[PDB]
Design a protein around this nucleic acid. Structure first.
Length: 150
RNA sequence: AAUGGGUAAUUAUAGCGAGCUAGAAAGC
């Protein structure tokens, strides 16, 4: 099996600078056990097994199903979820518990239960002890913000 | 009945605890 490195680059940055900052990512992708699809940065180096089945079709599809059948929580909510996923001490688990429970009582009570299943999903895979689900959620929310940008 | 006096209780209670939008754009 193979090991990829995907780098995101802006408009018209030169291909000499572009083919080298991506060789770094695919040698960081070769910098674990067998293979990895090292995405955007030098971290985010997920194994392909705990990618496509687990990020690109599991977590991002549930993130996409939440924020497209729902109206009141927007990019500000996703921004704070990414911030809490990026910092992540134990105190941020407490702050995330307070935040999600506090916004659950701030929906329309016809949108409370869809939010409640999403709250339980995000709080379950924020505190999951595997350590992988937080990183996968962070990259999945990266992808969802990169889709919905105007 | 006189005369001397006041004595006790509560000292805030129940909530909201931020929300949304932007999350970098042009150039060299």
């Amino acid at each position: 099996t193979l090991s990829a490195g995907i780098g995101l680059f802006a408009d018209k940055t030169p291909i000499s600078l572009m083919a080298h900052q991506t060789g770094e990512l695919e040698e960081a992708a070769k910098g674990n056990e067998k293979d990895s699809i090292s995405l955007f940065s030098s971290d985010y180096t997920f194994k392909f097994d705990r990618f496509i089945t687990n990020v690109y079709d599991d977590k991002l599809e549930q993130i996409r199903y939440f924020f497209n059948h729902q109206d009141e929580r927007g990019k500000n909510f996703i921004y704070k979820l990414i911030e809490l996923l990026r910092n992540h001490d134990r105190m941020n688990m407490a702050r995330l518990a307070y935040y999600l429970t506090r916004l659950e009582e701030l929906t329309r009570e016809t949108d409370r239960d869809k939010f409640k299943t999403f709250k339980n999903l995000f709080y379950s895979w924020y505190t999951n002890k595997n350590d992988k689900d937080r990183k996968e959620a962070e990259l999945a929310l990266l992808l969802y913000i990169y889709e919905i940008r105007k």
